[PDB]
């Protein structure tokens, strides 16, 4: 519809303390009279750039910083204006994570990193290595219990192992990232994922495992270990299970390298309540009591606010979190991250399910990760061989990449070539997120064509 003036609508992920944040809104409402509504829509990281592109959506959006460059590229975010004194209340490295092209485009909240969570009354000495987990799983299964269960559907949770022996997203080149240098196909990436797959072949893990299965199994005492972030600590607490949080196990003598996310709050560019949002985030949320209100619901973990993090220092769970973070990497915020994640999500699920080899799964990821480049570079061949656009046009429209008028202009053309030509040029101008949708649509609806071009480009590169 349109964004209501004199009100604040907030979006935050369903695994965060959204009831706690709503408590902060109530305090803001009591003092200022401004209503604050907190929501947690399914797949909000996808849903946001769809609705915001038309000038709809929440006043404030919460997500890890890695998606925020894509949003900023599309002009969905407003530039924020905290004073120098405000900025000093937070760690410098958290401001860096929310800087896109010299502009601050979000307020940092929480520093998120995965850790190894273990049942104390079942495993006094957690294994320091991934290697000894197969042996640990055989002797644990004799007692009707398993060694390790964690979410295998989201690449976030498998990435630490994949990166440990040398897998990386985009190569950092002394100041910036090179979007042509992807490291999902190297030997370290292959070896980390091959280990994961081998765990499954040897039936120490199952490819079907998601968040729901992994969480219930641990909190029932059915599995010895899991891998998760701080937000999951509440559900383990209430289950009265005695558990510890510690450094992730090593792979080949190298530490697991989790991708660190800075949970951040961006303000919709189309919002008429930017000042209200600033007041809410600076004066109310980013205070000791505001952060604790959220934490009571779901733990934030380590946080960006200096004064609050010092009080969290005495917590061994927080220390384990920052240790794990410091052995990992802060995620890039570049627009190509969405394509990176899609590429790794697909590679893991396919290798783990057995429908691709690790080599074939990762070979494709290398190409899927560089979405936009692939389409522009194969512009000539696509124009000729793409074919019927109905499903693709629908995809682009469902995802709000094209308007109705734009779709109909493509459908106007007399032949398939002129139709293809019209569509191709229009999408390239709309950003990385739009070409992702186009690439994914073509990959989903005509998978052969992508494989074919992938293969024709090899013969062109060989000669
Ligand atoms: O699995 C890919 C996924 O990883 C990260 O998502 C995290 C998120 O940062 C956390 O705040 C938490 O909610 O769990 C999510 C994992 O399911 C990336 O931030 C995200 O963009 C990416 O798609």
Swiss-Prot record:
InterPro entries: Maltose/Cyclodextrin-bd (IPR006060), SBP (IPR006059), SBP_1_CS (IPR006061). Its main location: periplasm. It holds the Pfam family SBP_bac_1. Keywords: Periplasm, Signal, Sugar transport, Transport. One of its GO terms (cellular component) is ATP-binding cassette (ABC) transporter complex, substrate-binding subunit-containing. SUPFAM superfamilies: Periplasmic binding protein-like II (SSF53850). GO terms for molecular function: carbohydrate transmembrane transporter activity; maltose binding. One of its GO terms (biological process) is maltose transport. Induction: Induced by maltose and the transcriptional regulator MalT. Permanently repressed by cold shock in a PNPase-dependent fashion. It comes from the Bacteria. It is found in: Periplasm. The complex is composed of two ATP-binding proteins (MalK), two transmembrane proteins (MalG and MalF) and a solute-binding protein (MalE). NCBIfam families: PRK09474.1. Belongs to the bacterial solute-binding protein 1 family. Part of the ABC transporter complex MalEFGK involved in maltose/maltodextrin import. Binds maltose and higher maltodextrins such as maltotriose. PANTHER family: MALTOSE-BINDING PERIPLASMIC PROTEIN, MALTOSE_MALTODEXTRIN-BINDING PERIPLASMIC PROTEIN. This is Maltose/maltodextrin-binding periplasmic protein. The lineage of its organism: Bacteria, Pseudomonadati, Pseudomonadota, Gammaproteobacteria, Enterobacterales. The gene is malE.
């Amino acid at each position: 519809m349109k964004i209501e003036e004199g009100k604040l609508v907030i979006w935050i992920n369903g695994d965060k303390g959204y009831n706690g944040l709503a408590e902060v809104g109530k305090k803001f409402e009591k003092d200022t009279g401004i209503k604050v509504t907190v929501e947690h829509p399914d797949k909000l990281e996808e849903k946001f750039p769809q609705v915001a592109a038309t000038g709809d959506g929440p006043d404030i959006i919460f997500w890890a910083h890695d998606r925020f460059g894509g949003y900023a590229q599309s002009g969905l975010l407003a530039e924020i204006t905290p004073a120098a004194a405000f900025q000093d209340k937070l760690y410098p490295f958290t401001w860096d994570a929310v800087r896109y092209n010299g502009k601050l485009i979000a307020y940092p909240i929480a520093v998120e990193a995965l850790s190894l969570i273990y049942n104390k009354d079942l495993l006094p000495n957690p294994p320091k290595t991934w290697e000894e987990i197969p042996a640990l799983d055989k002797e644990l299964k004799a007692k009707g219990k398993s060694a390790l269960m964690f979410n295998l559907q989201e690449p976030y949770f498998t990435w630490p192992l994949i990166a440990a022996d040398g897998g990386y997203a985009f190569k950092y080149a002394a100041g910036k990232y090179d979007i042509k240098d992807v490291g999902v196909d190297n030997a370290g990436a292959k070896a980390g994922l091959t280990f994961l797959v081998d765990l499954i072949k040897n039936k120490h893990m199952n490819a079907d495992t998601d968040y729901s299965i992994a969480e219930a199994a641990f909190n029932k005492g059915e599995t010895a270990m899991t891998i998760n972030g701080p937000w999951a600590w509440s559900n383990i607490d209430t289950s009265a299970v005695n558990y510890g949080v510690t450094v992730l196990p090593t792979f080949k003598g190298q530490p697991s390298k989790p991708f660190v996310g800075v949970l951040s709050a961006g303000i919709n560019a189309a919002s008429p309540n930017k000042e209200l949002a600033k007041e809410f985030l600076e004066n109310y949320l980013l205070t000791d009591e505001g952060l604790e209100a959220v934490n009571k619901d779901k733990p934030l973990g380590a946080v960006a606010l200096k004064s609050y993090e010092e009080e969290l220092a005495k917590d061994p769970r927080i220390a384990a979190t920052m240790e794990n973070a410091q052995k990992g990497e802060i995620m890039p915020n570049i627009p190509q991250m969405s394509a990176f994640w899609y590429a790794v999500r697909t590679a893991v699920i396919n290798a783990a399910s057995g429908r691709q080899t690790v080599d074939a799964a990762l070979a494709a990821a290398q190409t899927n990760a560089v979405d936009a480049a692939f389409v522009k570079e194969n512009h000539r061949q696509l124009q000729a061989r793409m074919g019927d656009l109905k499903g693709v046009l629908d995809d682009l429209q469902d995802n709000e990449v094209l308007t109705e008028n734009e779709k109909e202009l493509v459908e106007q053309e007399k032949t398939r070539q002129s139709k293809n030509e019209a569509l191709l040029s229009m999408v390239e101008k709309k950003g990385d997120l739009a070409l992702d949708v186009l690439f994914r649509s073509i990959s989903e609806r005509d998978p052969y064509l992508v494989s074919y071009l992938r293969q024709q480009n090899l013969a062109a590169a060989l000669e």
